[PDB]
Symmetry: C2
Subunit: 439 residues, 2 copies
């Protein structure tokens, strides 16, 4: 008999499993594919490696403005073996940590019908809509098998699509991204995105708006065509990638005969991650909290670790889904916490929203021998709601924006104000100091 059996060795189950492990629980975790799940084998990890890759290509393409004489070629199959070489080592490490802490791992698909508290941690799996030609399509996952390609088309404009198209261009591949609305990234502040799109277009990424693909044709093998509902046609794609969204691995868990609730396959739970049925719990994007979903590795890490506590020491600590810092690893990258300027106004009203923003050029681009206004930009935004100016949203796009936000999030959670930032003496010279002089 186990104190807790973990189903899902991805981000959530693992953390959960090892934490309870730490509190002396007899723990068991069963996995069917490689350990570390989505984030490790087909999300965050490789994605981030390919983002670094595309960063090296730009540095190589531009080293001449820094005194270097450079001639280089890129070979994607190599980036491929290095990167999978890496991934293979993590799985072994995870299985090592799993014996280090006394958890009894089991490889196999899990199914309900010996444990005292059973935790569902089976995240999603990709979504292919009923669209004509969809057979000729692949998913964000599959992209990680691509070692040859001259033209790629992505359908969607969510964060995965944009990160992927920017990584795709910067690897020598001709690139399109189809979007349903007026602009990609419809959920993020529109100014931050105006800068994103301007730069993408500057780098010849083709962005198509108001697109509804009603057909995916296959002239032949690796000669595909994308058909939109308005007359525009787009030919010659070796891969069309659908970045629709993802849905829980919930289909056959032999769950129904348990009256465990289900919205649209997502397992419902409470502040504590408890099911309708007690004993049985759920974290990871495979669930929905209420209802928030929120599919990010660190959130599922929080959840699982915190639960273990209510389960083994004390309840006190619960997961906060409010305030979730994000990084869109686009080119350039985007750091974003809290409300956009418009979300703010939908909540507190325009009479209460003041904004602070900046536009400048990273010092890195000083030697680039080109007209200033053509250098890659950096833009930031402070959205302030109230009277001594609480910061309800914080965003920036640029060189290293991925590394500048974490910290400001510690300050947004502490209800900091324009004035906290203003009394903060800045570090020079850095991109991040601009946040402190928005006067």
């Amino acid at each position: 008999v186990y104190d807790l059996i973990v189903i899902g060795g991805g981000s959530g189950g693992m953390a959960a499993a090892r934490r309870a492990a730490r509190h002396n629980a007899k723990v068991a975790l069963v996995e069917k594919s490689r350990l570390g799940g989505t984030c490790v084998n087909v999300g965050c990890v490789p994605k981030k490696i390919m983002f670094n890759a595309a960063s090296v290509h730009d540095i190589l393409e531009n080293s001449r403005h820094y005194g270097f004489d450079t001639k280089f070629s890129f070979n994607l199959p190599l980036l491929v073996e290095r990167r999978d070489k890496y991934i293979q080592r993590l799985n072994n490490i995870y299985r090592q940590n799993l014996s280090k802490d006394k958890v009894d791992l089991y490889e196999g698909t899990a199914s309900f019908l010996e444990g005292r508290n059973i935790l569902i941690a089976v995240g999603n799996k990709p979504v292919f809509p009923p669209v004509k030609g969809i057979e000729n399509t692949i998913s964000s996952d599959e992209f990680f098998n691509i070692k040859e390609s001259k033209k790629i088309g992505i359908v969607g404009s969510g964060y995965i699509a944009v990160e992927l198209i920017n990584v795709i261009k910067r690897l020598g591949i001709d690139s399109y991204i189809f979007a349903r609305g007026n602009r990609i990234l419809r959920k993020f502040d529109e100014s931050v995105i105006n800068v994103l799109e301007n730069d993408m277009k500057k780098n010849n990424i083709n962005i198509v708006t108001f697109a509804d693909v009603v057909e995916i044709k296959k002239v032949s093998d690796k000669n595909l065509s994308i058909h939109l509902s308005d007359g525009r046609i787009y030919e010659h794609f070796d891969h069309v990638i659908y970045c629709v969204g993802r849905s829980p691995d919930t289909e056959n868990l032999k769950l129904e005969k348990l009256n465990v609730e289900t919205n649209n396959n997502y397992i419902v739970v409470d502040e504590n991650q408890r099911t309708s049925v007690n004993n049985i719990y759920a974290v990871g994007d495979c669930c929905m909290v209420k209802f928030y979903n929120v599919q990010l590795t660190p959130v599922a890490i929080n959840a699982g670790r915190l639960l273990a506590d209510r389960l083994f020491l004390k309840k006190t600590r619960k997961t906060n889904y409010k305030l979730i810092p994000t990084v869109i690893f686009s080119h350039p990258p985007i750091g974003t916490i809290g409300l956009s300027e418009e979300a703010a106004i939908q909540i507190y009203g325009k009479e209460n929203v003041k904004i602070y923003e900046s536009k400048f050029t990273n010092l890195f681009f000083s030697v680039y021998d080109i007209e200033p206004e053509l250098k890659e930009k950096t833009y930031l935004k402070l959205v302030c709601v109230g009277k001594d100016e609480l910061i309800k949203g914080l965003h920036i796009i640029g060189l290293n924006a991925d590394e500048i936000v974490q910290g400001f999030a510690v300050a947004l959670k502490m209800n900091a104000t324009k004035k906290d930032f203003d009394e903060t003496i800045p570090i020079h010279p850095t991109a991040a100091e601009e946040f402190l002089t928005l006067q």
Copy 2:
């Protein structure tokens, strides 16, 4: 008659000058060399450009682990013209901003004997001690004229010396840095420095401890020798650089006949930057506050801007010299705010100091085809004083540490605690998130 005459168009005078400008003051500023002073023409700006340069060289030397075939040469004279090309454009811009805001600029040396409130902003100038051979030496400034060199020796181990030696190696130049104590950077946390030195030595930077140079010989032109007091001799240097420290440009201001006070050339002032003599004020590292000195661009920017206020709108706002975030642009870079673990214990006592630290490898180095333990490292430290654990010091050394700290400083000023950080959901995957899981 002027409402305020600014002496010194460096960081402080300029900001001061334009701010008061903003409040409708009849302002005048006089400069003798190029505008933007130390930070722009011989400090922060070029230094930072050369740091980026050395960053491109490492990226080029290692692109192969990312799929690239790279063959490159470096040519320092080019980095030199690009970089001075840049600097020339800033001076023009500064002189443009100076007409934009209605300040009457005057080029010439300033000397006391028409203005209502006169502001001293003349920072330092380098220091060469009475040492034998010192004639054969140069200063951090002069380094910016160097376009040829096979071996360089730096005397000192302060932040400028370390930044400069790391930049020097990464430009193909053989490198030594002489230090008086046991380790370079004696003012910063010793663990953060153990990692710094290990990496420097890993990259063949030679670090010499307990060194007292008592002689600087010149066998010939660009064939110099460094003599230490203990028997060690070090030959074949084209340039020996002395990074001793800097002293105020105060020597002949025709000041004495004014009973304006002087410690060791530094002009003394108060919380408000007022002299012994009123009407006359002082910011910039050319002064000493009490007594803090603190020679950083953003501090002198604060001071000058804030003064203008007491001078033109209201006093309320004063400069805080307590809590000064810093970045040592070493390789790797170091972000540091607040107390070291030992400074903490000199203040609150060991019974009250808890520490949190981490050591890991940036994901950037995942594909480097080398044994893990040989990859460039990242190390962080939380120094906590008290009971719910106030963070009195925060440090990290690594890839992008320069960009991760600004933000945490907003949080240290807000007396954040381990637990503020702990409730902060992290961004993945990033170097900076490690700060949030130090459990």
